[PDB]
Design a protein around this nucleic acid. Structure first.
Ligand SMILES: [K+]
Ligand SMILES: [K+]
Ligand SMILES: [K+]
Ligand SMILES: [K+]
Ligand SMILES: [K+]
Ligand SMILES: [K+]
Ligand SMILES: [K+]
Ligand SMILES: [K+]
Ligand SMILES: [Mg+2]
Ligand SMILES: [Mg+2]
Ligand SMILES: [Mg+2]
Ligand SMILES: [Mg+2]
Ligand SMILES: [Mg+2]
Ligand SMILES: [Mg+2]
Ligand SMILES: [Mg+2]
Ligand SMILES: [Mg+2]
Ligand SMILES: [Mg+2]
Ligand SMILES: [Mg+2]
Ligand SMILES: [Mg+2]
Ligand SMILES: [Mg+2]
Ligand SMILES: [Mg+2]
Ligand SMILES: [Mg+2]
Ligand SMILES: [Mg+2]
Ligand SMILES: [Mg+2]
Ligand SMILES: [Mg+2]
Ligand SMILES: [Mg+2]
Ligand SMILES: [Mg+2]
Ligand SMILES: [Mg+2]
Ligand SMILES: [Mg+2]
Ligand SMILES: [Mg+2]
Ligand SMILES: [Mg+2]
Ligand SMILES: [Mg+2]
Ligand SMILES: [Mg+2]
Ligand SMILES: [Mg+2]
Ligand SMILES: [Mg+2]
Ligand SMILES: [Mg+2]
Ligand SMILES: [Mg+2]
Ligand SMILES: [Mg+2]
Ligand SMILES: [Mg+2]
Ligand SMILES: [Mg+2]
Ligand SMILES: [Mg+2]
Ligand SMILES: [Mg+2]
Ligand SMILES: [Mg+2]
Ligand SMILES: [Mg+2]
Ligand SMILES: [Mg+2]
Ligand SMILES: [Mg+2]
Ligand SMILES: [Mg+2]
Ligand SMILES: [Mg+2]
Lengths: 44, 158, 136, 71, 110, 130
RNA sequence: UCCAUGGAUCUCCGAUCGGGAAACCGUAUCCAAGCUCCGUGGCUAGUCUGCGCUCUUUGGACUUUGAAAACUUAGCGAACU
RNA sequence: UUUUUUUUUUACUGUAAUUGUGAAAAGGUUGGAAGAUCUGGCCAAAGAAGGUGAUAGCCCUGUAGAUUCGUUCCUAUUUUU
RNA sequence: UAUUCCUCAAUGACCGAUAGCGUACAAGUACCGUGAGGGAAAGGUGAAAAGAACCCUAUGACGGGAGUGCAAUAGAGAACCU
RNA sequence: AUCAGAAGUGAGAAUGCUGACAUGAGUAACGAAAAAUCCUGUGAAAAACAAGAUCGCCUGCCAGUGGAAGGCUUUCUGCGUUCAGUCAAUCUACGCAGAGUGAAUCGGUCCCUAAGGAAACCCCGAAAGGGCUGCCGUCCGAUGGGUACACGAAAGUGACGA
């Protein structure tokens, strides 16, 4: 059947991309927490 | 299984070409000359001593058989021979009249004589070529001075 | 002289002298050489060319001394400019006091945290390289 | 030469692995300007000029001789 | 053969025979004796040699063969680096500001 | 000085690595590898100023470097640019130059596994691409 | 090789010249001064002067502060229990 | 203007000399190998520690110090508007 | 007086590979999730590679001999002490 | 040793935790009512590989052509069979190595805007922020409009349903 994940690159960059995170205070907190944990992938 | 936390020897009192005596191991009590020093392992190779047997399978390039070669000895297992008494001795540091570091025999029962730096060290392992290659500039062309700052000879095209 | 090849320029001057065109080396061409040599900051060779010009029979007027005094004052050397003023006074040239502006080049005049981190990084590498290498 | 990278660097967007309207570029120097009809006018003032001298008759070679010279 | 017959053959080692020997890189003190014109000519000689060497390494490794004398490439590379250092030294010692800036621009331009 | 132009290069450093062609005679085009920040005009002007080629046209394409991955460990080579250079006149490569004989022998080792009319051309141009 | 000091070179994002799907795209800022070279115009024509750009130097005009754990001082302020 | 140089004297977490210098003997036995054991000398302001073919103060690297080097002060950075 | 993003030196009737940090080993990785986020496993040949030339039987030596080594079930290719 | 001291101090059970290994069991299964057969070759081994012949299945939504979205080297050539493939595979979307993608016109970039998003100014709000896109107004944003200068506009337009 049709499943939940239907990939689209531009929607991924517009929802979870670097500048999408930089545009909100919560996204900037996500980036800071993300760098503090040491993840190699800061943004999706 | 190199399991020890062994630090490197930073300043070696044991040099290539030195006359030494093995003071520890299977070949204890035997003299020889230091062919090679393996600094990364704190080990040396004494010519003709500490022999192993290698089972080398002959490929298209090298030859097979069981070969006898030297295995490395730890640098603390050999000792420089006192040039006067002929016995193994420790090495001390003496500063000369000009101020140059030399090695002297050290220890009770030693002459204190200067242990000379081996003459083999000044010889190049890769000798210089006899004939220059087709892309090698001869030295007389290298030395041709075409630039002079005082008279402005060889300035750019400004 | 524009390419700062002053020795070759002097040799070409002498070669022009040898060819019989020495009369066309009047004061205008020598002043042009002095202007070029002062414009590319070769004041010592400019003084050499000035001395050769004085030995060639060309008579420098007020423009040559104006150029040389201005270049000497711009390089913050008032004594040499006054010396050329006295020389031009001796030669009998209509010279005057003047304000020459000095170039603004010759006028006289705890470890941070990233540095500590870099020092610790270097020391950590140095510790790892102080041991006997495992052969492989 | 092979060199180690992080596996996370494969997630950086590249136009080879993107929708067809994603443009990145390779830091090439521009040679002109875009037009508003979708074209491009190359301006020769922005083009490189290479000043290369003639190499015939030159005596200096890539390497310096290693033959034994003098003490 | 002896000489490259076309510009394509300048990407090949025509002098390779008897093991061929290659000298060392240029030293900075030896390059400080050379004029700007000689240094630019030597730069392009080194550039053509470097192009030939990388071409030979690329051709041989495409057929799973070893590239002989691989130390030839860093010799040329270091000689080119020393040439640019010597020319920048001459640019810094220039007393004229305009000439110094033009010499720096000539060295570093791409 | 800067009277001559805006972008004047006295010490070019563009790397050109020639790819070995399939044929040794009647070479109307050849391929080379270079860095991905090179443009068609840079390749053309370097090849005609430094080497004296008679360049008709330059085509370019970008390639990713070869990568090997084993789950966390990734090793890679650099991305490069491949350039096709079409010549105004055909050229040729001598047989005895190193390493042409070895390359041809290896290539032939990997590939092991009269009725002409009037006004028929014999050596025509063979150019690929668009 | 290596060490100490001082130098030359010194890609990009984060990021701050503008745009942006981070690691890309577009960018000779603007305006006074004084100097070699460059080009063109005009006099009664000789060390004759008057107009310019490009790039160089010194300034001054716009604006770019900027990160960082805990501690500190403040604002707002739960619920389980 | 520049160079040579009179230049006091001690103190320092200066965790300075990355990794400078830095003491101290020989035999027998067993054992693959000696540091073990038996005989028997010596250093210690050094018996912290890590190695070396087993458990080594004297085999090696160190270690305590001692020397060098560089901050202080004696040796005022003053004078002119 | 408070605190430790940090540096240098030192200590432990602290732990010793299911313990000790999530990580003694290229770990905030692999892997899972659209995302915020969650989150591993895996140490030890031998003193030294001397890592087993050569023979025999199998398609193929990891086998059986031989040889190295104090010792070879101490014979391994992110793994061989017991 | 002994005598004392410090405790993360004693396992058989918590549908306890981690790892290892059994049982069921050589059992179920080997995944769409298209389908196989033989000669020759290769190899240690061939129903499953190569090449050929015979036979069948798909032909307007499982089955052909080109490609968007996604994937990202799976493409091709040589070598190979440790892993994978519902195999004992010599073969392969598998391992090693090398190679391959050529544009003025194709698709993008670029110009233009929609829905929408955001700055500036202004309004509002314990903080964080929220609103406002205009009467003079900026920058983004295709799923649409454009294809051989630049500047300007009280000219026309572009310009549209079933
Ligand atoms: K309550
Ligand atoms: K010391
Ligand atoms: K020893
Ligand atoms: K010891
Ligand atoms: K764990
Ligand atoms: K054992
Ligand atoms: K249980
Ligand atoms: K198709
Ligand atoms: Mg993800
Ligand atoms: Mg060891
Ligand atoms: Mg890197
Ligand atoms: Mg692609
Ligand atoms: Mg760029
Ligand atoms: Mg550069
Ligand atoms: Mg293209
Ligand atoms: Mg920016
Ligand atoms: Mg020391
Ligand atoms: Mg000592
Ligand atoms: Mg010890
Ligand atoms: Mg033991
Ligand atoms: Mg375990
Ligand atoms: Mg255990
Ligand atoms: Mg653990
Ligand atoms: Mg074997
Ligand atoms: Mg053991
Ligand atoms: Mg308990
Ligand atoms: Mg228990
Ligand atoms: Mg159960
Ligand atoms: Mg049953
Ligand atoms: Mg049944
Ligand atoms: Mg069944
Ligand atoms: Mg058959
Ligand atoms: Mg078949
Ligand atoms: Mg449908
Ligand atoms: Mg693959
Ligand atoms: Mg395939
Ligand atoms: Mg293949
Ligand atoms: Mg098989
Ligand atoms: Mg299988
Ligand atoms: Mg494959
Ligand atoms: Mg188009
Ligand atoms: Mg709108
Ligand atoms: Mg809005
Ligand atoms: Mg707002
Ligand atoms: Mg914006
Ligand atoms: Mg727009
Ligand atoms: Mg569109
Ligand atoms: Mg319409």
């Amino acid at each position: 059947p049709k499943r939940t994940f239907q990939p689209s690159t531009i929607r991924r960059k517009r929802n979870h991309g670097f500048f999408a995170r930089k545009a909100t205070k919560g996204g900037r907190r996500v980036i800071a927490r993300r760098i503090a944990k040491g993840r190699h992938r800061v943004t999706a | 299984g190199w399991k020890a936390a062994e630090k490197l020897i930073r300043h070696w009192k044991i040099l290539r070409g030195d006359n030494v005596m093995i003071i520890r191991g299977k070949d204890k009590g035997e003299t020889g000359t230091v062919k090679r020093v393996i600094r990364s392992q704190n080990r040396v190779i004494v010519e003709g001593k500490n022999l192993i047997k290698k089972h080398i399978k002959g490929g298209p390039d090298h030859e097979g058989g069981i070969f006898t070669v030297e295995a490395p000895l730890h640098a603390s297992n050999v000792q420089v021979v006192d040039p006067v008494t002929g016995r193994p001795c420790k090495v001390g540091v003496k500063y000369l009249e000009d101020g140059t570091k030399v090695r002297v025999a050290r220890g009770t029962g030693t002459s204190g004589s200067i242990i000379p730096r081996p003459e083999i060290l000044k010889i190049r392992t890769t000798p210089r070529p006899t004939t220059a290659g087709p892309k090698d500039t001869p030295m007389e062309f290298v030395w041709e001075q075409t630039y002079d700052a005082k008279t402005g000879k060889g300035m750019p095209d400004l | 002289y524009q390419a700062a090849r002053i020795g070759e320029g002097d040799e070409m001057i002498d070669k022009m002298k040898s060819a019989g065109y020495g009369k066309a080396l009047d004061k205008k061409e020598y002043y042009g050489f002095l202007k070029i040599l002062c414009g590319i900051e070769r004041l010592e060779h400019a003084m050499s060319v000035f001395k050769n010009m004085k030995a060639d029979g060309c008579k420098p007027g007020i423009k040559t001394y104006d150029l040389l005094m201005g270049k000497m004052c711009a390089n913050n050397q008032l004594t040499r400019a006054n010396g050329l003023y006295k020389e031009a006074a001796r030669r009998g040239v209509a010279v005057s006091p003047k304000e020459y502006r000095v170039d603004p080049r010759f006028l006289k005049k705890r470890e941070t945290l990233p540095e500590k981190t870099a020092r610790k990084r270097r020391r950590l590498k140095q510790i790892n390289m102080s041991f006997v290498k495992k052969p492989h | 030469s092979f060199r180690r990278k992080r596996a996370s660097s494969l997630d950086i967007l590249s136009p080879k692995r993107a929708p067809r309207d994603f443009y990145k570029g390779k830091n090439c120097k521009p040679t002109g300007f875009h037009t508003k009809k979708g074209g491009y006018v190359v301006q020769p003032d922005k083009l490189p000029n290479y000043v290369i001298p003639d190499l015939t008759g030159f005596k200096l070679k890539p390497y310096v001789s290693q033959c034994p010279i003098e003490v | 053969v002896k000489i490259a017959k076309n510009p394509l053959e300048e990407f090949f080692e025509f002098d390779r025979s008897k093991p061929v020997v290659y000298g060392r890189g240029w030293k900075a003190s030896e390059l400080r004796l050379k004029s700007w014109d000689d240094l630019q000519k030597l730069w392009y000689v080194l550039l053509k040699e470097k192009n030939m060497l990388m071409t030979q390494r690329q051709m041989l490794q495409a057929q799973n063969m070893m590239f002989p004398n691989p130390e030839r490439i860093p010799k040329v590379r270091r000689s080119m680096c020393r040439i640019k250092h010597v020319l920048t030294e001459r640019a810094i010692e220039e007393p004229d500001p305009r000439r110094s800036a033009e010499m720096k621009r000539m060295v570093n331009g791409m | 000085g800067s009277r001559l132009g805006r972008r004047v290069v006295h010490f070019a450093n563009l790397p050109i690595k020639l790819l070995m062609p399939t044929k040794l005679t009647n070479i109307h085009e050849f391929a080379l590898r270079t860095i991905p920040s090179a443009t068609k005009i840079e390749i053309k002007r370097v090849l005609e100023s430094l080497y004296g080629f008679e360049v008709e046209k330059v085509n370019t394409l970008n390639m990713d470097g070869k990568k090997k991955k084993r789950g966390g460990l990734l090793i890679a080579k650099a991305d490069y640019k491949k350039a096709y250079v079409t010549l105004k006149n055909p050229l040729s490569i001598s047989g005895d130059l190193f390493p042409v004989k070895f390359i041809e022998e290896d290539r032939k080792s990997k590939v092991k596994g009269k009725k002409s009319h009037w006004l028929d051309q014999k050596e025509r141009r063979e150019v690929g691409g668009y």
